[model samples]
Target: MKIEEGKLVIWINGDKGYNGLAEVGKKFEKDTGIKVTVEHPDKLEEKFPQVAATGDGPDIIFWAHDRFGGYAQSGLLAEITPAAAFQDKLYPFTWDAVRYNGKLIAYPIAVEALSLIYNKDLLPNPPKTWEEIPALDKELKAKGKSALMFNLQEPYFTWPLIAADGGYAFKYAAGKYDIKDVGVDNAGAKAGLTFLVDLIKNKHMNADTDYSIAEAAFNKGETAMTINGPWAWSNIDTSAVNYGVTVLPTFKGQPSKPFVGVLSAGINAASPNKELAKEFLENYLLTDEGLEAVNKDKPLGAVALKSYEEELAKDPRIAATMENAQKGEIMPNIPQMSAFWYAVRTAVINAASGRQTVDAALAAAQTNAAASNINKAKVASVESDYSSVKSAALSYYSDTNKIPVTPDGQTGLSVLETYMESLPDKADIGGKYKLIKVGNKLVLQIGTNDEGVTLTEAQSAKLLSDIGENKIYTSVTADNLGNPLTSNTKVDNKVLYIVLIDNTV
Candidate 1:
């Protein structure tokens, strides 16, 4: 192997340990006589593809292992075989994350998985099982406290509960994922969701709790337990609360399995400095001394090096996260995971919020994930550009017994133009709002992408009121409005705010 560029360049996402890497880079340059440039680029993930495609990018990219599957499939990554000495030192599971299409494509740096973090000051001992939560909740409530908290809507943190009885996002085997085989709505998953719903219904947990709220409550010692990862320790360590981290308790004698993540570094397929990059990574970055230096400025949660384990063992949270990762499932590095996110999130939110039953939600999730085009609607923000139009229409509809309808000769925009204080311009994402007649009523449809939007049950009722069209307009906020499809690959994304201007109101 020859060092073509004479320098090794690495691009990392954030500022967490840029200085540490820079210091290590100094040592690498001094020893190898090859200059090293460490960069913390903004939107590194977004920029990597375009820049690398043109054969101009960093020699190595440091990012979460899940993303590299797509990069590897796109031919953006150079496959490398780690020395046995280097490979054997890392936890074997970490290697699973760095492999794509049965080829080892990167080097793993750190590992993380969700763990049950409890306030030791509030609860002397954590619950031994999920069944103990209700009784513990009663005790905590009596003390003006709460039992458990997590992002109720997020499937990433909640999947352990779903996996307690053998539920998984997809059927993974060999090096491929069977997207069609979604197990999220299986009997086991339904049972898991039922548990979460029962907790919310019984007031043991808050239905609307989010990640920030869960962590804040735990930091304040207002909550007894929370499900979080090692990254949470930075803030928790600053709080006065004494905490303990452990794997989630069993449910019905079955253990829960969270999704494990690996933070890794990969060589660019087009990098002229492939030789130098490999040397910097395998010889320097993956070394025990190198990892220690990388985490010197800011600890990188849980490191993958077994030699580094002795130092990480000093902190129980790091040790517990590592332990949980071993017992957990490696996060599937496949395109189907995006659909899984949408399906699981929809199920969790609907079931936990009491909007729908566990069976109904889980079944819907199965349908949602397996299908390609899934449309969803929700109340996003209360503000809207069409506020004046809605107000004027409501006033006219109230005065006359009939609501305003689009004149046969005019467009829907023309009808709304009469009520607008000033006609607002079209948008870049979904284009302009157009009116269409739904039977005897007028409906406002905005934006035209592949995946169309539907009106929420709550927003539909407010269609003819003083708040008419506000929810609909506000919901079309993002370019991918009402879309859960995260890939840059374009889809038929459309945003239609069906604000019925009719007597049905």
Candidate 2:
């Protein structure tokens, strides 16, 4: 490949900052005198969309395959057909994530999947399925220890267990995606959820709650096993803990298949130097050096089949994760995936929180899917916080305000906050509340209550100011309103506060 000249701007995400990419760029420049300018943004998610929207982003961008679906649908990505020289050289599964409308919009650099990482001292042989976990739990319980570390609160992390048991969130059949797929609604998904509930109810797994806490428990030897991916491998202390990883156990004759996400490099459609950007991808992204960069530093499964077996084995977690990934299904690159994700999460949250029966939760999810008005309207207008938050919260809440009513009949606000805090870092707070940016101010509106109470302008302004200023407030109140107004309440009489985090885009 002949290297193109001029300063080539390459935008990258991940742990690889300017320094990391610069190292690779130096090697490439040595081979072909091309001055590579790498812009490593602090927040690629925010920057990429802004840049892509304006059609003035960098020549190349490093992002995940899951994100490609939205970018491609919006026509922000350039499709590179599999017939392209480098396409065939990549793994089929890795390429699958970047494929939308039968066009390859991105190139894979790294692949990852979930694995069962357990204490080798306790579990000489890891359990192979959901059925085996209970017996193993019993054995651990006999020793006054727990069998596993898992966050029942997170649907994304736990849904794979359901998938392993022959359950599915969305069924892709007859060349279209259908949320009505009841394959997961069968006995298998129920079994998986039951298994999780039992673990929590029985104390066989640390009910200490979130994955972080579970990981801490596992590290401290409080739990014998946990479900995690390759990233956890490096953070774990292997000194006192004899840790071993294996592919997640099989269920219903189907191996545990976690959602496989591929980290990839995408060419910016608005690049001033498209040909050079293509050359950069051809040389660095599709070569052995590129593969090595990802495997050695980032530590993920390689997108090249030739690299998978070799590099995966080097790290037991990577090996197990890749093994599971081989049996796994690639997450869809569909535009409606956001809605699907929220719907699935709603069901999972209901199941996790003990708010609704799994069947009821799934049913509500299906209803929401059928009623989603997201695709029909502009991305911003239809994708409001109120719509997303209400959809998810209603699944878990009894009231229309989307606030959970406690078992004791008290508001579930404190309990819900605790639950939200227990969620993983990547956890999504759906559309129960609306985060609106009106002028320079941002407001969070928890839609109208049944009583027709609405948040006053003063309340909205105070909530936003307080949340923005102080990061420590567990809960906001009316008394400590940062800026008071002449009126104490509003016409609607609804209580709303601005969440510190702007989850609703």
Candidate 3:
């Protein structure tokens, strides 16, 4: 391939972006005389859309794998199929995300995902199951230390648990996409949610701590383990803390899967130097020097399959991260994937916050997702028709007056138990939901219908008051019901509830 002999304008997303790509550009220029001018986006998301809309963007741009779907759909991204001859030289699964509607749209540069980063000094052998984590927690606590550092408040961060439990956000079947097949309500997903929730609920994990705090906690030997990716390696003082990496533990032999993201340099389709762009990409980006730049700075696995093992193994941290990636499921670039991502986050957050039951959260997520994808139908109608029975059963539990109290003293508690039992064992409630117990208040939140309802303050206050007074009441109010969908007249309606009992004690 003849070296391109012109200025190559590359627009990077941030400063770190410039560092990685600039190195590649310098090497390309040194070898091919292609003067590379790199420009960093001041505000990547805001600026890229405007630039893309104008049809006068840079010859190449770096971006997240998730954003590529929208860019490809809008014709803002160039189709890289013309360079298909070079596909074998790249990573197999990295480019999997750049395809949309059967056309290759981008070239991946680097791949990254979460891994179990632990202090070798503390946990020489990391726990491999949810059962083991508790014991590890106890051991850590006895020494006034923590076993893990994670932000339980977000669903995306908790994806490994869902994966370990064999839950997926979207199910791709027979080369077709179906939102209805969403795995948010599966038994594995629920078990995953339950594990995380129990961790936070039981005080085994801390939610108030930020990433920096967690890193500090780890460095100070306050924490024994954490869920982190390549991004954190630079910040941690690994010299003092003997740390190692591993794949997250599994449930039933299933691996805790992370969302694998491949970042790549995509050429603009409309660029006048199309042939030159392809040559430049192959020679500069996929070359050994290019791979070295990516590995040295980003510390992520290079998309060059042949070079990855050799390059990654050079650094123990990078090696461990690559090993962890082997256990992950690559995130898809499907157009409807946007709905799944947000819906999963919403569902998971609701579950984690105790605003919704695991079942209700996953069901609501499925319903909302279907509505978002089903262009011809309203989500409310679909939810009402499909989940009416389960919704009614959940509603029944919230109604205090409807408590089935027979003269024989049967309180229909079995029915509630049955409803809980009926919930799928593996459910995918992404990090959007939480289970919270503030004093005596016990709340079970369901997914919000399209109407955007949540638990009302009055209901929460009353429930808390009742729990404090040890009073038992039976009557379902709008406060207790988790109704995301509401009428125009009931816009202020609550979507979650707090159920209180006078005295089971």
Worst 10 residues of 2 by lDDT: 422-431
Best candidate according to TM-score: 1
RMSD of each: 11.3, 12.3, 14.8
The TM-scores of all predictions, comma-separated, are 0.68, 0.67, 0.66
lDDT of 2 by residue, 274-303 (tens): 666676677665566655654455455545
Tens-place lDDT digits, model 3, residues 196-226: 7777777787646556677787777788887
After the best TM-score superposition of candidate 2, give how far the Cα of residue 245 lies from its true spot, in angstroms: 2.3
Candidate 1 global CA lDDT score: 0.72
Q: Residue-wise lDDT of candidate 1 within 168-269, one digit each (tens)?
A: 887878667887888987889988889888988888877889978898999998989999866576677789988888878888788778888788888999
| Residue 21 lDDT in candidate 2 | 62
Model 2: CA > 4 A from native:
1-22, 29-47, 54-59, 81-83, 138-145, 151-154, 179-187, 206-208, 219-221, 237-240, 251-254, 305-319, 369-447, 451-505
Scored by lDDT, model 2 comes in at 0.59
